Amino acid sequence: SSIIRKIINTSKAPAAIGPYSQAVVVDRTMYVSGQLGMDPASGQLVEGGVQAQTKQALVNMGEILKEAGCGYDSVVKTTVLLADMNDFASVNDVYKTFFSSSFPARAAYQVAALPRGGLVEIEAVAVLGPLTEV
Amino acid sequence: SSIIRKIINTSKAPAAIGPYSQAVVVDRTMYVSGQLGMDPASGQLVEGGVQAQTKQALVNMGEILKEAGCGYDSVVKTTVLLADMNDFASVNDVYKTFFSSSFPARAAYQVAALPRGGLVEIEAVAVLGPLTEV
Amino acid sequence: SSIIRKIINTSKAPAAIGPYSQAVVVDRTMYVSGQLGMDPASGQLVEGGVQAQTKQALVNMGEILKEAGCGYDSVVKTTVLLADMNDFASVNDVYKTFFSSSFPARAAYQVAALPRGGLVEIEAVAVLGPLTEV
């Protein structure tokens, strides 16, 4: 009845920019921090705008999931935080390439500002497999 | 040790306006997407302002819960996202009619903007019964 | 297969300012409401600015955790909601004194406004021990 916690850390995703872990696993549930569109090597936001940042944020998420033994199919809930609501459709177009069926539950909204002036931040809850779809 | 995931979908609530499922059940935990005050049939936000939209959002939530075999008493956490903080009391008055005792945990705040220009969006976590209160 | 829910309530933290419980425990998972920097006795936001409010919010969180038999080490995920993104570093300095290692997963962002005009609101997910770190 003792629950195992694992702090997930991989250099394949950027170092946290504050006092947080990239993700925390407790039993089979994985809480993934808000991912920004940052290059893992320089820590800087990638160039090219909201789609580029969304892609990088979700690539970063994928590396964190993989470090825990999971993939995008393990994600059950996300929150998509935008700097500009006008970007919803552009963000959705990128997002659906990573989550293409059996989509996560989601909330999405425009916030006042994101860390580092990012255009998008995406957090997630995942469940460590095996997963059976019904 | 294989966890069952169920994508929840009912035409009694609006179709998702983006690449997300209305809700996802994993084992006994149900992640409910951010609900807007949209009519399920037309997909348009209901008329009449923030209380009308809050009511419709929570009716939509209820239909999603029912599709999974749950009711409002299964909800353990919500997030209430507002277009206008001046609406907190009006939203609370509606909200407490759906969640009237053993209230969910909650966070609430004003965001910059919601999809479709909505006035309120409400996401939730629920647990599939039976539930025992202690 | 019946899941135990416990509504957490302690006068050592402020009374909820809306129709929500301070926290809800379901099985071993605890959903903690968004904590504001409010004095438990008067319900007013504490004086002195964002660090003072962050400290009080996290003291309040700690009293709620303790009421459930948990401590700060039980927290696996937080969300930090700011009135001003310029406060990220100041908030982080306070936050890391409460969560000093094996940090929770986290999302952080500036919202348009918080209840009562607060400068910071912090919600959390915790898991009731014993917890084993791996």
Residue numbers in the entry:
A (entry chain A), B (entry chain A), C (entry chain A): 2 to 135
Can you quote the paper on this entry?
In the present study, we identified two functionally active RidA genes in the salmon genome, here named ridA-1 and ridA-2, and we performed an extensive biochemical and structural characterization of their products (SsRidA-1 and SsRidA-2).
The acetate molecules likely mimic the carboxylate group of RidA substrates. SsRidA-1 is an efficient catalyst with hydrophobic IA and possesses a mainly hydrophobic 15–20 loop. The conformational stability of the S. salar RidA proteins was studied by monitoring the change in ellipticity at 220 nm, which reports on the α- helical content of the proteins, by varying the temperature from 20 to 98 °C. An almost flat trace was obtained for SsRidA-1, indicating that the protein conformation was not affected in this temperature range.
